[PDB]
Paper text:
However, the 6XHis motif usually behaves as an intrinsically disordered region, adopting various conformations, and is thus extremely rare in electron density maps. In this study, we report the serendipitous discovery of TetrHis (acronym for Tetrameric His-Tag), a metal-dependent tetramerization motif with minimal sequence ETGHHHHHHWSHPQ observed in the cobalt-bound crystallographic structure of a single-chain variable fragment (scFv) antibody.
ScFv 2A2 crystallized in space group I121 in mother liquor containing 10 mM CoCl2 and the structure was solved by molecular replacement at 2.5 Å resolution using a homology model of the scFv VH and VL domains as the search model. The asymmetric unit is composed of 2 scFv molecules that form a tetramer with a twofold crystallographic axis, i.e. a dimer of dimers. Each scFv monomer adopts the classical arrangement of the VH and VL domains, and further dimerizes through a ~ 650 Å2 VL−VL interface that is stabilized by 15 hydrogen bonds. The most striking and unexpected feature of the structure is the presence of electron density for the C-terminal sortase recognition motif (266LPETG270), the 6XHis and the first Strep tag (277WSHPQFEK284 or only 277WSHPQ281 in one of the two chains) of the Twin-strep tag (WSHPQFEK(G3S)3WSHPQFEK). These 16–19 residues form an extension that adopts a tetrameric arrangement stabilized by 8 Co2+ ions. The tetrameric assembly contains two 6 residue-long β-strands related by the twofold symmetry axis, and the 8 Co2+ ions coordinate 3–5 protein residues each, resulting in 4 unique metal binding sites.
Residue numbers in the entry:
A (entry chain B), D (entry chain B): 19 to 137, 158 to 284
B (entry chain A), C (entry chain A): 19 to 138, 157 to 281
Write the structure that this text describes.
Amino acid sequence: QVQLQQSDAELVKPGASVKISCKVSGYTFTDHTIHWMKQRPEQGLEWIGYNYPRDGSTKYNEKFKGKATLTADKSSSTAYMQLNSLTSEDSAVYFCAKGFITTVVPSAYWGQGTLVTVSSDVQITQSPSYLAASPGETITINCRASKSISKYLAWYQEKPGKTNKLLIYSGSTLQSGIPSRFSGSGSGTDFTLTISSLEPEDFAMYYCQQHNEYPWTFGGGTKLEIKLPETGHHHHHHWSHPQFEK
Amino acid sequence: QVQLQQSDAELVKPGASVKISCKVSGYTFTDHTIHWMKQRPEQGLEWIGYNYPRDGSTKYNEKFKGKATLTADKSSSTAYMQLNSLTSEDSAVYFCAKGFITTVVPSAYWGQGTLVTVSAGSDVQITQSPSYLAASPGETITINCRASKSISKYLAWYQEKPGKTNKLLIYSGSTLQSGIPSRFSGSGSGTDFTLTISSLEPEDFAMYYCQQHNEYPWTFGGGTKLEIKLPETGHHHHHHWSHPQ
Amino acid sequence: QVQLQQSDAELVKPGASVKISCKVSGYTFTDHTIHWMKQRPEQGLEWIGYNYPRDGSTKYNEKFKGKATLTADKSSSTAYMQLNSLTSEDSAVYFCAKGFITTVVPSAYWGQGTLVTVSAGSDVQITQSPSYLAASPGETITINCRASKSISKYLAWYQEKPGKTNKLLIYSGSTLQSGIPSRFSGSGSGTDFTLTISSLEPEDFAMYYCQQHNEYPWTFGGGTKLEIKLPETGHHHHHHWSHPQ
Amino acid sequence: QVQLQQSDAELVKPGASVKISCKVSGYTFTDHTIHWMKQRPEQGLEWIGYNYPRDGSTKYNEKFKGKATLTADKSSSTAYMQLNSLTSEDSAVYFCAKGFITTVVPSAYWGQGTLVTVSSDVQITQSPSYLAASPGETITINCRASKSISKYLAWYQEKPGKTNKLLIYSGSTLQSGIPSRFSGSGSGTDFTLTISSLEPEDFAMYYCQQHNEYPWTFGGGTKLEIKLPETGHHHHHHWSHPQFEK
Ligand SMILES: [Co+2]
Ligand SMILES: [Co+2]
Ligand SMILES: [Co+2]
Ligand SMILES: [Co+2]
Ligand SMILES: [Co+2]
Ligand SMILES: [Co+2]
Ligand SMILES: [Co+2]
Ligand SMILES: [Co+2]
């Protein structure tokens, strides 16, 4: 029961700052970095940087240097990110996640996100971007890296109302607690995620992430939809990217 | 310069018959079988049977006997299929295709199809997935195909583009048909197969079908549509999910 | 023997430019304008602008200035469109088309289109309906088109079939383009128009678009897909309906 | 408030008979014929015949002679149809409807149907058979008759959970109580129904019917679906042909 509780949605004017928070419980706060991520529907997931609470050190993705300031308060087990000189391009959902010590290791423990509304790197190509199939069938998602990342590709399942779930890391090792019908493959630049015996729960956003070097970089995302055959009885509901779910 | 020239579309009343034709040129007619397939548009493909012109032998998909009668006229190098007691469920596109008398592997030469409009058990089941997928030129996608019992390696893949005859991409799981670009590849054995297209080109966006050619009747997957992706918008939109009962 | 020969598909990174070309043959190049259109596949068509080669004049859809620059080279009878500061929303098919220097009515001669892939106010609004419809060869269907303000009679209709250039069916509401079969007819005036196809033939199943040519910028309906009907089954199946909030 | 209350669904073995009933209220029973119709999803609407309660006379469509027997009981204002020598082709929904005296006039007052499960005429081509459009837009349905029916074509809206609704009769005259955005046109063999300012209520089965001569004959039917744009919020539900709604 590692929980990251993020602060309420923010609606700010252009040019202002916002400081959003991340309250951690269920492990010793000072033992691991806190990572911060930005997500927009069009641009996907981006890594802003990490902050190490024990020591107060930070590492920033060059693209977010200056834009973001990461701090931590050891007494409250709370991490903060302040965004300054806000513009409409800063409108997104921002996530915090527990890292392992100060490693490149991807996080399996993400916060729920905070919506902010203003009013030589590894590039990864993810495909297909949208996919439809049936319960019981098997589908495959591809991710191609712009340079060799060895075997260090992770896969996430992002479902509405749940925090981001780590499926696979290091290319093919199945995360604890994930069903074996999830499997990953590849090394160097060409990777795949295969989901077999599809079930209705599997509708979600899927993302790959290289964890071979900083900055962390993500694929553009894949949306998976599941049939029901119109011969049977069922329901049709709606879900959206987290930015519109908030 | 191979033609399988098929007769024009038919618009007939229920209860009638039609005799559609398949005029072959560019190889020895009596040295090869003619296979016949039924498709309802965009949807599932089925194998009707084959006719061997030299001796007049026919083999039918059990489900199509009585419905179809296959004959050939050796003098004109034309093969025929007669459909009788037509009903609305007979409304479909019907294809002829050159058969090989040496392998189980299907041929790369199909007719353009004939449209028929009616108005006024231990077979291998093939499941294809995903049924639709969106990507961009330059990217890589992979299509899955599963057989209900082992077909060893004998799985073929086809690309259907409108206004062109069916294009054989792969047969026997991984062997590339002559003339097919190397960005296509297939793999699998027994029951689990995949077709992978890398560095997609604008022409690869199309319909795809797998087909086991390990035993008769030949059976096909339901089809996969590869469409050009639309960009994720920045405005409030919704997606769908479902659950039974 | 008219060609509008368009350059090959582009796969470019965001922020780059592309210069796509349109090589005309079969009529006097400098005696006619070149119009340019953007389409995202299957979806909405937009008019970018025109270029007159003899004097170099250009007229832009206000929404596309800065995005597009139209030029022509009279010596090679080639017209060009340069797109700059490319973004993913620029990913589309771009068409050139012969313009008339005498009427407002559009021409029947389009290029085949060029695909561009980017990765790694008082205008007349045109609403087309139904967006999809199913029928059978031999039957009759009619497509509606409504303009947000009066366009008098100046409405055109196009048939888009894959692998063929855009086909002009009707212009000015009811006038049949040369060579178009009489089972096509259009009617309407002001804001309410229809295209009616009787005795449908297998080739008429396609995408259709209306376009007002009464004022610039030229604007298009969203498109209508005419598909072959599937037969009503005798087994328990479900249909859908919806309601807001 | 003319009501036709039909008896409960029947499930019979092949070769048996069934007698289904039709209890009328809201007008004088003996003043008008009772029409009986058969509906299957594939074959559409068919006219079996009518029975005149005042006099006990019957008129049958030749195709149903022998198969159906129509009777009426004046004391109970109930009409009956007995189906004999049942086969699986007899499985359908059967409707009764109030006629006007003993005329060809189409009915605006239909019963809800009874589902039965076994375990030189004017032919009309209706097209399109399926149609999708948006609120506010306008659509057009065609019906072509095999011989001249003058102006005598009617249009019905069949919505799940409602009895069949008469929209237009005599080609173009709008039935009382129907909105003016419904309109019909044509004479001889070529007819159209036009629905403008489409609203979500308009999803239904639509059928044309010639009322120029007996036997009454119907078009094959058109299914109309209405968008909602996925940009807004809405619900998706299911409906079916009456045979599966029962
Ligand atoms: Co459904
Ligand atoms: Co539900
Ligand atoms: Co919403
Ligand atoms: Co989306
Ligand atoms: Co249905
Ligand atoms: Co929806
Ligand atoms: Co509801
Ligand atoms: Co049901």
